[PDB]
C-alpha cells in the first residue's frame, strides 16, 4: 500500500517541491548532519585501513572530501525528510478538520466521578 505515491499536485521526480521552501531549513550544526559527517570520516578511515595506509594521517584531502560529501548529501536528505513529515501532519489535520463526525470531543470526566476497580497487592 502506498500512502503518498499519488497525492494530487505531486511532481514525479522533483525531490523538493516549491512548497518545501516555506519550512525552516535544518541548522548547519544539526546533530544529524554532524552524524553524517562522522559517517564520512569513518568511511575515510576505513578507506585508509583497507589500502594499507597510515589510518589517521594518510590522505587529508581524501578524508576532507569524504566528510564534505556526506554532509552535502545529508543536508538535502534532512530537508526532504522534514518536508515529508510536515506534509503528513498537514494532511492529518486537514482530514480531521473536514470529518468532524469521525473525531468527536466527548465530555471530560474528573477522577472523582470515574469508578476504577482497586486490585489489592497481597
Amino acid at each position: 500500500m502506498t500512502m503518498m505515491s499519488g497525492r494530487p499536485g505531486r511532481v514525479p521526480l522533483q525531490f523538493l517541491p516549491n512548497e518545501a521552501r516555506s519550512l525552516p531549513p535544518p541548522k548547519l550544526t544539526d546533530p544529524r548532519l554532524v552524524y553524517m559527517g562522522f559517517l564520512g570520516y569513518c568511511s575515510g578511515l576505513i578507506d585508509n585501513a583497507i589500502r594499507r595506509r597510515p589510518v589517521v594521517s594518510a590522505g587529508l584531502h581524501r578524508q576532507l572530501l569524504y566528510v564534505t560529501s556526506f554532509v552535502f548529501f545529508g543536508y538535502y536528505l534532512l530537508k526532504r525528510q522534514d518536508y515529508m513529515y510536515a506534509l503528513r501532519d498537514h494532511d492529518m489535520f486537514a482530514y480531521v478538520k473536514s470529518h468532524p463526525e469521525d473525531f468527536p470531543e466527548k465530555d471530560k470526566k474528573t477522577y472523582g466521578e470515574i469508578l476504577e476497580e482497586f486490585h489489592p497487592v497481597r
Binding site: E19, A20, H90
Partner: protein
C-alpha cells in the same frame, strides 16, 4: 434495466431506391452535387444524435431527393445514362477509367438539358456547413452525474508537530 424503444414497422416504410451499385456509381458525382443539402442534414443529424431512431425523417428526405434526381435523369438523359452505366457495370472493379466516351456523352446530355456541372476533383470531399433548426442535443451519451472529487489541499505548510515522532527520536 428498462425496455428498448423501437419504431413500429409502419414508421420504417418509404419509397425505395432500387437501382444497382453500377447505376449509383455512374450517377454518383451529379447525385452528390445535386442532392447535397438533405444528405448533409441527415449526416449531421446522424453524427450529432448518435442514435438512428432520431434521424428517420431525414432519411426519408434523402430517399425523396434521390428519387427526384433519378426521375429527372430518366426524363431527360435515359439512353446516354443507360450506356454509361452498362459500361461501368461490365467492369469487375467498376472502373471509371475504362468508359470515358459514355461518361462524356452523359455529361454533355445533362449539361445541356438540366445545366448540371460535374464536380471537380477534391470538391465532394470538402467539409461543408449545414444550417438547421434542429436543436443541438445536450447529453447525447446519456451520461449520469459525475462524482465530485476530493476537495483539495489548502493552507500554508508548517513543520510537523514534535518532529517525526518515531519512537525515541526528538527530531
Amino acid at each position: 434495466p428498462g425496455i428498448v424503444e423501437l419504431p413500429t414497422l409502419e414508421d420504417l416504410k418509404v419509397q425505395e431506391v432500387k437501382v444497382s451499385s453500377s447505376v449509383l456509381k455512374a450517377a454518383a458525382h451529379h447525385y452528390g452535387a445535386q442532392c447535397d443539402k438533405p444528405n448533409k442534414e441527415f449526416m449531421l443529424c446522424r453524427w450529432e444524435e448518435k442514435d438512428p431512431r432520431r434521424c428517420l425523417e431525414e432519411g426519408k428526405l434523402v430517399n425523396q431527393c434521390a428519387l427526384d434526381f433519378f426521375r429527372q435523369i430518366k426524363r431527360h438523359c435515359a439512353e446516354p445514362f443507360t450506356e454509361y452505366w452498362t459500361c461501368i457495370d461490365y467492369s469487375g472493379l467498376q472502373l471509371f477509367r475504362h468508359c470515358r466516351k459514355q461518361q462524356a456523352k452523359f455529361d454533355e446530355c445533362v449539361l445541356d438539358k438540366l445545366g448540371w456541372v460535374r464536380p471537380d476533383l477534391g470538391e465532394l470531399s470538402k467539409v461543408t456547413k449545414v444550417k438547421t433548426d434542429r436543436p443541438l442535443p445536450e447529453n447525447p451519451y446519456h451520461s449520469r452525474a459525475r462524482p465530485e472529487p476530493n476537495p483539495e489541499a489548502e493552507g500554508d505548510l508548517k513543520p510537523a508537530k514534535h518532529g517525526s515522532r518515531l519512537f525515541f527520536w526528538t527530531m
